[PDB]
């Protein structure tokens, strides 16, 4: 039930493919007509072969869905579906006694309830973070039954809440994986550079199980590093190691093979090393001033616009970012699958990672807060060894209020106590200093290392020309990072640059908007909205949006719009400028 670091390097067996499914809008499979739980609900996975008895379902003769994936793009009937779908899987597994077996979900949106062989394993909320169950003692010989009740109903108190600008993709959206472990295993570990110290590798390791005190060995063959330690009685041990590793950067994404070994377990990883700091309005990677030439990206696939989960999906999206000239990607509005981060790390993209605290969250709900902080904790726990990640962001656009402020401040501080290296960000509130002159105004900026905010001058705030008459001033000399900007266009739809939603309008906007960005003092990062057209239920212009937010520089069908090349040209100037 605790997070497992680097699942892909473990002893894994996939459960993916196609599973039997039951769409259950009124949750008949969970509650009876009194609205109470009942034995004999669908969790029992009872093949309906004796027809002298009465039951109301039969996984064995029902329809399939693919796992992993959203359900919305797999059947017309499921496009808008919000509610419960039951997934069932049968599998066999041979586990020698003493060995341990875990069931890992990369992600399930939004609530998952899980049973093995008719016995409840647990419950998860939050649709974008992994979770594990140990099934060591519940495995049976022969056929095992795995049942997952998945529900994506919008909940006022959820994270996110009843309103948002992206599709409500339900289902088992990321791979489902079995993991075999020795009785005491390497559960967690941290291997990064010490804060601001390019000559000190530091980290720790965490065993799990009963034989908690063991000789650990950390190997980095290419750095001639062989460090030994012994975990204390809590299965914990820390270390410092002197080394001068080649530093990861976007232009040389240097990664090192790291091998961890205990007396009873072992695991390998790819880990690069860098430092990241603020100095006034400057952002410093390995002590050099950099500009973050970024782009924002939803976890949505090329061509057919389902939930992304694979390396193929990551590679195609990033290869567009590459052509766009980015050295940075913002992954909105939630933690993406581990393959996106790994592929960004491999190709040399810095990363902004993020939780879906977004619009009208319930700031007074003690449960809502626990939810969001759990997501924050899990986002950082999974990716803490990914050096291309330099910004953690604890909030998107939010209405201002004292409850909001106290909520986000708790997240910001918690982020800082988990990762004293990377930069903490959040979407800050904007204020008019005097006409034609804008600034930021958020008392949460004291817990942030950057001045991050969204603005849509020229699309939602005025026509394009208004980018020509807006300017920005700041009362603090922290690096300024604009996390969203842009506007919509349908690829192939042409006309006057005054005609909104044409490629021509969007091109004119990006020209003028870039000129406005060139005037902003302290500007050190931008990630326009967005790389690719994506699904939203808030976009209803027929033949133009068709349930798609059209602010992509690339169409959902991979076609580069005219505005793609405006941003591309600017990023070329910027690359030479900071070279």
Ligand X SMILES: O=C(O)[C@H]1O[C@@H](Sc2ccccc2)[C@H](O)[C@@H](O)[C@@H]1O
Contact status: 336 vs Cl ion (CB under 5 A): no
Contact status: 549 vs Cl ion (CB under 5 A): yes
Q: How far is the CB of 487 from ligand X (least distance, A)?
A: 8
> Using CB distances below 5 to 8 A depending on partner kind, what does residue 576 bind out of ligand X, Cl ion, its own copies, none?
none
Distance CA 527, CA 548 (A): 20
Closest CA to 554 of 253, 280, 297, 274: 297
Hey, which residues between 185 and 214 contact its own copies (CB under 8 A)? none
Q: Which two tokens stand for residue 513?
A: 């908007």
Contact status: 397 vs ligand X (CB under 6 A): yes
String of contacts with Cl ion for each residue 244-283, x by CB under 5 A: ----------------------------------------
CB closer to Cl ion out of 293 and 550: 550
Contact status: 312 vs its own copies (CB under 8 A): yes
Phi, psi angles (nearest 5°) of residue 563: -65, -20
String of contacts with Cl ion for each residue 460-499, x by CB under 5 A: ----------------------------x-----------
Which listed residue (396, 398, 506, 526) binds ligand X by CB under 6 A?
A: 396
Distance CA 578, CA 288 (A): 9
Distance CA 566, CA 561 (A): 10
**Is 396 annotated as belonging to a binding site?**
yes
Which listed residue (10, 187, 551, 561) binds ligand X by CB under 6 A?
A: 551
Distance CA 14, CA 172 (A): 14
Hey, which residues between 265 and 304 contact its own copies (CB under 8 A)? 301-304
Q: Which residues of 511-533 are buried (b: 16+ CB within 10 A; e: fewer)?
A: bbbbebbeebebbbbbbbbbbbb
What residues form DSSP beta bridges with 115? 120, 147
Distance CA 549, CA 537 (A): 9
Phi, psi angles (nearest 5°) of residue 556: -55, -20
Hey, which residues between 78 and 97 contact its own copies (CB under 8 A)? 78-83, 91-92
Q: How far is the CB of 165 from ligand X (least distance, A)?
A: 4
> Using CB distances below 5 to 8 A depending on partner kind, what does residue 287 bind out of Cl ion, its own copies, ligand X, none?
none
Contact status: 481 vs ligand X (CB under 6 A): no
String of contacts with its own copies for each residue 417-456, x by CB under 8 A: ----------------------------------------
Closest CA to 297 of 276, 272, 277, 324: 324
Count of chain residues binding ligand X (CB under 6 A) = 11
CB closer to its own copies out of 41 and 235: 41
Q: How far is the CB of 72 from its own copies (least distance, A)?
A: 10
Q: How far is the CB of 33 from ligand X (least distance, A)?
A: 6
**Is 539 annotated as belonging to a binding site?**
yes
Distance CA 163, CA 165 (A): 7
CB closer to Cl ion out of 14 and 55: 55
Are 42 and 24 in contact by the 8 Å Cβ rule? The answer is: yes
Q: What angle (nearest 5°) sits at the alpha carbon of residue 142, between those of residues 138 and 144? A: 45
Candidate ranges 228-236, 365-373, 415-423, 493-501; the one touching its own copies (CB under 8 A): 493-501
Are 457 and 437 in contact by the 8 Å Cβ rule? The answer is: no
Hey, which residues between 320 and 359 contact its own copies (CB under 8 A)? 359
Which listed residue (12, 28, 243, 409) binds its own copies by CB under 8 A?
A: 28
Are 501 and 550 in contact by the 8 Å Cβ rule? The answer is: yes
Q: Which two tokens stand for residue 288?
A: 């050099």
Are 528 and 552 in contact by the 8 Å Cβ rule? The answer is: no
Q: How far is the CB of 161 from ligand X (least distance, A)?
A: 13
Instruction: Fill in the DSSP letter of residue 375.
Output: H
Contact status: 35 vs its own copies (CB under 8 A): yes
> Using CB distances below 5 to 8 A depending on partner kind, what does residue 550 bind out of its own copies, ligand X, Cl ion, none?
Cl ion
Contact status: 157 vs its own copies (CB under 8 A): no
The secondary structure of 351-373, three-state, reads EEEECCCCCCCCCCCHHHHHHHH
Positions of E strands within 319-444:
328-331, 350-354, 389-393, 423-425, 430-434, 437-440
**Is 165 annotated as belonging to a binding site?**
yes
Contact status: 545 vs ligand X (CB under 6 A): no
Distance CA 97, CA 100 (A): 8
What lies within 8 Å, CB to CB, of 471 at 6+ separation is 436, 437, 438, 516, 519, 520
> Using CB distances below 5 to 8 A depending on partner kind, what does residue 529 bind out of its own copies, ligand X, Cl ion, none?
ligand X
**Is 358 annotated as belonging to a binding site?**
yes
String of contacts with its own copies for each residue 393-422, x by CB under 8 A: ----x-x-----------------------
DSSP, collapsed to helix, strand or coil, labels residue 455 as coil
Q: How far is the CB of 548 from Cl ion (least distance, A)?
A: 8
Q: How far is CA 312 from the centre of its chain?
A: 17
Q: How far is the CB of 392 from ligand X (least distance, A)?
A: 17
Cα radius of gyration rounded to whole Å, the chain:
25
Are 423 and 392 in contact by the 8 Å Cβ rule? The answer is: yes
Contact status: 51 vs its own copies (CB under 8 A): yes
Are 49 and 14 in contact by the 8 Å Cβ rule? The answer is: no
Residue list for the binding site = 165, 358, 396-397, 454, 460, 529, 539, 549, 551
Residue list for the binding site for alpha-D-glucuronate = 165, 358, 396-397, 454, 460, 529, 539, 549, 551
> Which positions touch Cl ion (CB under 5 A)?
488, 549-550
> Which positions touch ligand X (CB under 6 A)?
165, 333, 396-397, 454, 456, 460, 484, 529, 549, 551
């Amino acid at each position: 039930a605790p997070q497992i670091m680097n699942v892909s390097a473990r002893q894994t067996t996939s459960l993916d493919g196609q599973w039997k499914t039951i769409v259950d809008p009124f949750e008949n499979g969970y509650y009876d007509y009194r609205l109470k739980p009942y034995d004999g609900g669908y969790a029992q996975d009872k093949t309906y072969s004796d027809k002298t008895k009465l039951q109301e379902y039969d996984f064995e003769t029902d329809k399939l869905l693919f796992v992993p994936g959203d359900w919305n793009t797999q059947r017309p009937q499921l496009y808008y579906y919000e509610g419960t779908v039951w997934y069932r899987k049968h599998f066999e597994y041979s586990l020698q006694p003493g060995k341990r077996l875990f069931l890992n979900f990369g992600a399930v949106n939004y609530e998952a309830i899980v049973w093995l062989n008719g016995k409840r394993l647990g419950r998860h909320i939050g649709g974008f973070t992994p979770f594990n169950f140990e099934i060591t003692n519940l495995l049976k010989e022969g056929t095992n039954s795995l049942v997952v009740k998945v529900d994506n109903k919008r909940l006022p108190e959820a994270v996110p809440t009843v309103n948002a600008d992206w599709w409500n993709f339900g289902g088992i959206t990321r791979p489902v994986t079995l993991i075999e472990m020795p009785a005491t295993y390497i559960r967690d570990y941290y291997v990064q550079l010490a804060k601001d110290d390019k000559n000190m590798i530091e980290g720790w390791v965490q065993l799990e199980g009963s034989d908690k005190e063991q000789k650990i060995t950390l190997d980095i063959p290419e750095l001639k590093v062989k460090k030994e330690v012994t975990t204390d009685a809590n299965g914990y041990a820390s270390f410092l190691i002197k080394s001068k590793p080649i530093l990861w950067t976007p232009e040389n994404p240097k990664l090192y093979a790291v091998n961890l070994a205990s007396e009873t377990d072992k695991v390998s990883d790819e880990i690069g090393f860098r430092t990241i700091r603020t100095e006034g309005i400057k952002i410093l990677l390995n002590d050099k001033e950099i500009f973050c030439r970024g782009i924002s990206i939803h976890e949505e696939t090329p061509y057919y616009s389902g939930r992304a989960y694979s390396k193929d999906h990551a590679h195609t999206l990033l290869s567009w970012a590459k052509e766009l000239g980015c050295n940075f990607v913002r992954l909105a509005h939630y933690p993406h699958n581990e393959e996106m981060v790994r592929e960004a790390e491999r190709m040399g993209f810095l990363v902004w990672s993020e939780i879906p605290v977004y619009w009208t969250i319930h700031w007074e709900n003690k449960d809502t807060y626990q939810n969001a902080e759990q997501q924050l904790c899990d986002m950082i726990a999974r990716d803490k060894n990914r050096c291309n990640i330099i910004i953690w962001s604890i909030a998107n656009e939010t209405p201002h209020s004292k409850t909001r402020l106290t909520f986000l401040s708790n997240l910001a501080n918690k982020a800082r106590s988990l990762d004293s290296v990377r930069l903490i960000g959040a979407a800050m509130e904007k204020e008019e200093v005097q006409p034609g002159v804008l600034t930021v105004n958020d008392p949460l900026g004291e817990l942030l290392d950057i001045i991050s905010f969204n603005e849509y001058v020229g699309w939602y705030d005025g026509d394009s020309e208004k980018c020509d008459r807006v300017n920005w001033t700041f009362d603090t000399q922290k690096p300024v990072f604009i996390s969203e900007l842009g506007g919509g266009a349908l690829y192939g739809h042409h006309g006057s640059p005054k005609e909104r939603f044409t490629e021509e309008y969007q091109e004119d906007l990006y020209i003028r908007h870039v000129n406005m960005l060139k005037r902003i003092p302290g500007l050190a990062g931008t990630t326009p909205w967005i790389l690719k057209d994506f699904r939203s239920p808030r976009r209803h212009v027929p033949e133009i949006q068709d349930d798609f937010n059209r602010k992509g520089l690339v169409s959902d069908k991979g076609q580069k719009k005219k505005a793609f090349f405006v941003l591309q040209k600017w990023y070329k100037e910027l690359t030479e400028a900071y070279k």
